[PDB]
């Protein structure tokens, strides 16, 4: 134990006395286990007849480590020897939480195949102990649909299944249960989020914020010492009042306001009317119908897209959006088409519905379909089939991409064609090699753009430092624009990959700063988009100050992207400081219509849903990635790579892709009969509880509120009292509480 002990300290313990290991000391057995791992790495296949005593040593060391609360040290031993499998055999009821927590905290850094190995091992430990909600969370992290189905139907507790259904509905994952399953109706309704609108409205009534907000109350022009202005104000009205169902400006007679906008503004403004009716399909379509019959070309298609916006995030058994939008995907007018595919994509995002995809796919190949229409179709079909690796969508997107001429690919709408392709394989990983080989035949510089986009989307939210190294190598060689388009995609990809875990994101912030410092305009025109993607709905002061330093940038595109990133970073946070900065920018950019429009967009985002909504793609304590939210954010941010022509041009409706990422920052405690149940809870900044044993506090700087409270980014919530037991450890979204038998004993 004292000197190096290379193949020695193990050897004599192996050949000598084989009595109980702990009889020779905790430090000695720790050294012995370290040596066991070291020599296990050395041993080859032919030395399989050398591990006979080693298995006995590990089978005795693991219970010893768990006996003296050294569970984490035990975990490393089986991790190094790649034999974590037997761990589940020796887990006791006093340590399953700690070992599972440590193994899950480790998974964000170990690469494949140890990623899935650790994930499945912790899943098995949870399943053995009947901890169904966390097992379902863990399987969702594994995107194993068969395992999701098995976990859901294995549990016999109806209430636990209801909570798991709530988690699945929040994640955007849906299951087709059998009618033989008890409580099929309510379980399906929970998983379809049909009650999301009513729950949100009940919260808002409880949180007395039902009053509509005019964009003037956000602008606050009375404290300050056009078609674009009207369009920006309609966007602000849609964002602030999102999913509320009431507005003083469009829910009233909005024809004067709606016609106050001109050209494609009427496209977004009418579509904005669908944002206030988000998740309220039944009531929302009742207001869309009036504008569905408008003679003006823009109004009808704007209402068509508002239909899908209204239906976005909620799965209706009788598909309304498909019915209202099917008859306009091959319309002669490109605007009616444009609205229809985008609405259909928003409505059925993350569904992989073969009927919708078959209805939508020939639109891309239609001769009358313009490049804008083809890009919109690609974005939609990607959003329906996000992370599904759909063969049909991949094949047709490849056909559309290689059918276009080289001069046709110069258009930036073609940039949306790989994105949907990338959306198809979002988070899949190494399933793109065939796709990359297919893309190799595409002409350049569009080939580099497409390859970067699909590769990043494949490695989205993985933290693979190798892919980040490749992206930084792409960003390294700068070109004295046309050839350098994919550099912005690589900059966005650094964020798209590093967003998985906190350490990687904070590390990548410095890299983004260096890219902004040394990079070319096209290189630095995407750093704000990367900052927005990596810190969406998370208004930490470092990113806000970094973006503010470049808000008044010499490059107009950098300024626009920085302002929009400031809006996205504090999106839905209702941050007072960020509101003050945006007001100051509006005063500063008063004479610049583009910068003022971006400032108004940022102001609208900052008060998204009156501060009750978030665009963050990560839920379940920032461990579960929502593929639909990632798809929407990716759509908006990649479209912002050409903010001059797409956002500030005629295609600002793409901002409604953010609708795919809108979720309520929620904590609603339900009874076992799904009625609301106000409970005292403590909300405070989350504290990492890996390592330190015993009971460490998981929240710092907390306050006690009644349960219908909004959780900020990084804010955990723990039940203040012990009267109720939560069905799931994660107190986010809709949580069911059960009366504690121990309480009031």
């Amino acid at each position: 134990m004292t000197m190096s002990g290379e193949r020695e300290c193990l050897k004599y313990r192996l050949v000598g006395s084989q009595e109980e290991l702990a009889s020779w000391g905790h430090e000695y057995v720790r050294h012995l286990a370290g040596e066991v791992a070291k020599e296990w790495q050395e041993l080859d296949d032919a030395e399989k007849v050398q591990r006979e005593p080693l298995l006995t040593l590990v089978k005795e060391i693991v219970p010893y480590n768990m006996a003296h609360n050294a569970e984490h040290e035990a975990c490393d031993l089986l991790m190094e020897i790649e034999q974590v499998d037997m761990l589940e055999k020796d887990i006791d009821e006093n340590a399953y939480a700690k070992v599972c927590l440590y193994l899950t905290s480790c998974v964000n850094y170990v690469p494949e195949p140890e990623n899935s190995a650790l994930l499945r091992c912790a899943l098995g430990v949870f399943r053995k102990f009947s901890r169904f909600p966390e097992a379902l969370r863990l399987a969702l992290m594994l995107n194993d649909m068969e395992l999701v189905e098995d976990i859901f139907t294995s549990c016999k507790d109806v209430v636990v299944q209801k909570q798991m259904a709530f988690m699945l509905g929040r994640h955007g994952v849906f299951l087709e249960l059998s009618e033989d399953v008890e409580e099929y109706e309510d379980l399906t309704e929970i998983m379809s989020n049909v009650q999301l609108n009513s729950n949100f409205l009940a919260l808002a009534r409880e949180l007395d914020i039902m009053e509509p907000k005019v964009p003037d109350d956000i602008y606050k022009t009375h404290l300050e010492n056009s078609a674009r202005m009207n369009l920006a104000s309609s966007f602000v009205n849609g964002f602030v009042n999102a999913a509320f169902g009431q507005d003083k400006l469009l829910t009233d007679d909005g024809n004067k306001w709606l016609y106050k906008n001109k050209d494609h503004g009427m496209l977004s403004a009418a579509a904005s009317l669908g944002m206030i009716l988000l998740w309220d399909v039944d009531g929302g379509l009742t207001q869309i119908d009036k504008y569905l019959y408008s003679s003006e070309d823009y109004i009808k298609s704007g209402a068509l897209l508002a239909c899908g916006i209204v239906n976005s995030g909620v799965r209706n058994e009788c598909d309304p959006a498909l019915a209202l939008l099917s008859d306009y995907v091959l319309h002669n007018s490109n605007t009616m088409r444009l609205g229809s595919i985008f609405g259909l994509g928003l409505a059925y995002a993350g569904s992989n519905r073969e009927d919708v995809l078959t209805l939508l796919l020939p639109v891309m190949g239609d001769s009358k379909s313009s490049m804008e229409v083809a890009g919109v179709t690609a974005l939609a079909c990607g959003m329906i089939a996000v992370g599904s690796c759909n063969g049909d969508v991949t094949s047709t997107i490849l056909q559309t991409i290689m059918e276009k001429s080289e001069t046709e690919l110069k258009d930036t709408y073609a940039r949306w064609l790989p994105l949907g392709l990338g959306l198809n394989h979002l988070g899949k990983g190494e399933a793109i090699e065939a796709i990359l080989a297919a893309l190799e035949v595409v002409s350049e510089p569009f080939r580099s753009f497409a390859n970067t986009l699909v590769d990043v989307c494949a490695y989205a939210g993985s933290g693979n430092v190798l892919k980040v190294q490749q992206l930084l190598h792409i960003c390294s060689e700068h070109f004295d624009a046309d050839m350098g388009a994919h550099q912005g995609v690589a900059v966005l990809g650094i964020a798209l990959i590093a967003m998985g875990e906190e350490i990687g994101a904070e590390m990548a912030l410095r890299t983004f700063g260096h890219l902004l410092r040394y990079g070319e305009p096209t290189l630095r025109r995407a750093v704000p988009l990367a900052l927005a993607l990596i810190s969406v709905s998370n208004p930490r002061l470092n990113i806000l100050d970094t973006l503010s330093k470049f808000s008044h940038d010499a490059d107009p595109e950098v300024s626009y992207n920085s302002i929009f990133a400031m809006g996205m970073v504090g999106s839905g946070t209702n941050n007072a400081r960020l509101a003050a900065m945006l007001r100051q920018l509006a005063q500063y950019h008063a004479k610049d219509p583009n910068n003022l429009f971006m400032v108004r967009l940022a102001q609208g985002l900052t008060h998204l849903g009156k501060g009750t909504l978030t665009l963050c793609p990560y839920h379940s304590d920032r461990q579960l990635m929502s593929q639909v939210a990632v798809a929407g954010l990716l759509t908006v941010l990649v479209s912002f790579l050409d903010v001059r022509n797409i956002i500030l041009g005629k295609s600002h409706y793409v901002l409604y892709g953010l609708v795919a990422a809108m979720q309520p920052r929620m904590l609603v405690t339900f009874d076992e009969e799904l009625r609301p149940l106000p409970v005292s809870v403590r909300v405070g900044q989350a504290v990492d509880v890996v390592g330190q044993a015993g009971k460490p506090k998981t929240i710092t700087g907390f306050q006690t509120h009644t349960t219908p409270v909004l959780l900020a980014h990084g804010e955990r919530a723990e039940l203040a009292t012990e009267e109720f037991l939560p069905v799931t450890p994660i107190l986010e979204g809709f949580v069911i509480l059960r009366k504690n038998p121990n309480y009031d004993l």
Binding site: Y102, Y109, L472, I503, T511, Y518, A590, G691, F702, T704
Partner: protein, 270 residues
């Protein structure tokens, strides 16, 4: 003509002072020497490797004019020598400010890019070019002699063991000035902020200042000692000014303990 509009919100400097700056590496948990801490450290290391390679490449193909030492030399040339010390009177714009030199003459000059613009507040000492008076820096103000006067540089040698019979008093003062710093988790878990203020009263010689010395011995916070009679000044408004500056210095060195000894002497003595 229209007045310039600043892009910064407010007119005061950034509240944060003396941070780790660019060395703010993410806090890796757990501190225990486990494989997860090992993996987090490796991840930080890989990000640093990627950053190092990228920066080396960029500086490699950067022009000879644009180099770190070359840009620093150009900054020195732009500042020139000598660098006059003026007073930031007003921030007209992001890159424009009214500054007054030591001779009392004001100038509407331009703030250059390399100036730390978050260090600029009205009344702060700025460094200006000798010829064009353009703001070229912000002078880190030296510690005031009064700052030295309050601050107790060396902890007193009197400890709690040197105090006899004041068990309850020691407990009460520890619950307010020592326990909140050593064990804040008690207060956080109880949901109460610690007792705000403490006054020690009693007949002369009973050990009030001795207990304050014992607190100053075993405190990790900056200790400022002020006698009440020191708050009586010779000029109007100088007393309130001294109190305001004492608590400003207390705020600067947070966490801190302000010991206003013999407070009654402000009123009992004329």
């Amino acid at each position: 003509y229209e007045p310039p509009v600043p892009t910064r919100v407010g007119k005061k400097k950034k509240k944060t002072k003396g941070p780790d700056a660019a060395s703010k590496l993410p806090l890796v948990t757990p501190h225990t020497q486990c494989r997860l801490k090992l993996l987090k450290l490796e991840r930080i290391k890989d990000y640093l490797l990627m950053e190092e390679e990228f920066i080396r490449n960029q500086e490699q193909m950067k022009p000879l004019e644009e180099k770190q030492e070359e840009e620093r030399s150009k900054v020195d040339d732009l500042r020139g020598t000598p660098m006059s010390v003026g007073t930031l009177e007003e921030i007209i714009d992001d890159n424009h400010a009214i500054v007054s030199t030591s001779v009392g003459s004001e100038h509407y000059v331009s703030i250059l890019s390399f100036v730390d613009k978050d260090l600029l507040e009205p009344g702060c000492s700025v460094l200006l070019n000798h010829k064009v008076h353009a703001v070229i820096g912000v002078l880190m103000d030296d510690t005031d002699p009064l700052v030295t006067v309050m601050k107790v540089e060396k902890a007193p040698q009197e400890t709690y063991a040197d105090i006899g019979g004041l068990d309850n008093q020691i407990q009460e003062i520890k619950e307010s000035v020592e326990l909140p710093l050593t064990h804040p988790e008690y207060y956080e878990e109880m949901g109460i902020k610690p007792p705000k203020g403490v006054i020690l009263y009693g007949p002369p010689g009973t050990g009030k200042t001795l207990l304050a010395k014992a607190v100053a011995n075993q405190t990790s916070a900056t200790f400022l000692r002020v006698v009440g009679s020191e708050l009586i000044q010779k000029y109007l408004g100088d007393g309130p000014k001294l109190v305001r500056e004492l608590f400003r210095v207390a705020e600067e060195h947070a966490p801190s303990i302000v010991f206003i000894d013999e407070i009654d002497a402000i009123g009992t003595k004329r």
